[PDB]
């Protein structure tokens, strides 16, 4: 019933990577290219992408809903243009999670004029636990997360009416 959006990893913490140019034409805000608000699209900076070894220790008294993703280009040319490392991965680990993603480069139809595909994953960190990301490319890193401050009894209603 209640989410508390907190900044686990600040966009001001990405200095060895370009963390302000990861916009797209497919999500226009005020008719200008932009991107999701709660996740950051890391790209190469000065044609170099040293591995991200990031980590976060869930210090609150509750659980945390952490979102991240992976970007699949449509050809190795876009890989090099977006990431110097030509074969990449994202390794995520917690007290339970164990997940090593690899991007699937393929040719495919254009949706919203964009062929590349972003696939987002999610998990819930328990109190007093930690999450560990590592990667060398294609990392749609989290910029925000959600504290689960109030459980309850609820539902999701597929309806069209107004309030």
Q: List residues binding ligand NAG (CB under 6 A).
A: 57, 109-110, 129-130
Residue 2's binding partner among ligand NAG, a second copy, none (Cβ under 5 to 8 angstroms by kind) is none
71 three-state secondary structure: strand
The span from the CA of 44 to the CA of 111, in Å, is 25
How is residue 5 written in tokens?
């959006």
DSSP 30-64: TTEEE--SSEEE-B-SSS--PPEEEEEE--SSSEE
Q: How far is the CB of 131 from a second copy (least distance, A)?
A: 8
Residue placing its CB nearer to a second copy in the complex, 48 or 55: 55
Pick one of 95, 149, 150, 151: the residue that binds a second copy (CB under 8 A).
Answer: 95
Q: Which is nearer to ligand NAG, 31 or 113 (CB)?
A: 113
Answer yes or no: are the C-beta atoms of 11 and 47 closer than 8 Å: no
Q: Which 3 state secondary structure label does DSSP give 12?
A: helix
Instruction: Check residue 117 for interaction with a second copy (CB under 8 A).
Output: yes
Structure tokens of 100? 């090593």
Residue 132 bridge partners (DSSP): 55, 93
Q: Per CB under 8 A, which of residues 1..60 are in contact with a second copy?
A: 53, 55
7 binds, among ligand NAG, a second copy, none (CB under 5 to 8 A by kind): none
Nearer to ligand NAG (CB atom), residue 18 or residue 129: 129
- Interface residue list for a second copy (CB under 8 A): 53, 55, 72, 91-95, 97-100, 104-109, 111, 117, 119, 129-130, 132, 134
């Amino acid at each position: 019933n209640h989410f508390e959006k907190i900044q686990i990893i600040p966009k001001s913490s990405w200095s060895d990577h370009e963390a302000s140019s990861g916009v797209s034409s497919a999500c226009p805000y005020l008719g200008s290219p932009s991107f999701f608000r709660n996740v950051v699209w890391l790209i190469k900076k000065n044609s170099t992408y040293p591995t991200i070894k990031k980590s976060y220790n869930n210090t609150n008294q509750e659980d945390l809903l952490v979102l991240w993703g992976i970007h699949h280009p449509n050809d190795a040319a876009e890989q090099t243009r977006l990431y110097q490392n030509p074969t990449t991965y994202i390794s995520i680990g917690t007290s339970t999670l164990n997940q090593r993603l690899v991007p699937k480069i393929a040719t495919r139809s254009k949706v919203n004029g964009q062929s590349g595909r972003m696939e987002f994953f999610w998990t819930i960190l328990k109190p007093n636990d930690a999450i560990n990301f590592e990667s060398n490319g294609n990392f749609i890193a989290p910029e925000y997360a959600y504290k689960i401050v109030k459980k309850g009894d609820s539902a999701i209603m597929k309806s069209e009416l107004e309030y």
